[PDB]
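Researcher: Re-running this chain for the archive, since the previous output was lost when a drive failed. Same request as before.
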Amino acid sequence: KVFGRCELAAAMKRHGLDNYRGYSLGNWVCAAKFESNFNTQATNRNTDGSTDYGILQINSRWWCNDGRTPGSRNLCNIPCSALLSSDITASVNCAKKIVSDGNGMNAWVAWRNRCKGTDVQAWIRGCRL
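Model: Regenerated structure tokens:
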């Protein structure tokens, strides 16, 4: 499902990511746009031999079960393809838990150096929540 600028963020707030762990929604908009660029079906081969799933590019290395990974942990206790669905609540529901380790949005490479240090509100300006 191709997500619009106005479409995705509106859901993430309903999705209960709005200011979640003090992280402003614009981060959540921006991060999605940097990891899969509003593509929910987005999956990628991690070089270390695991795979990225979900619009939030959630790494199957220990988060989910993609059926190709030895030593996968599955902490989120979901199949990886539930991250690829037209419902945001699967991806979001384990992204909450990714910050739920308290190890920050530093789990996402894209926010990490390309979405920090900028105007945060700039994703959610001109859209209604």
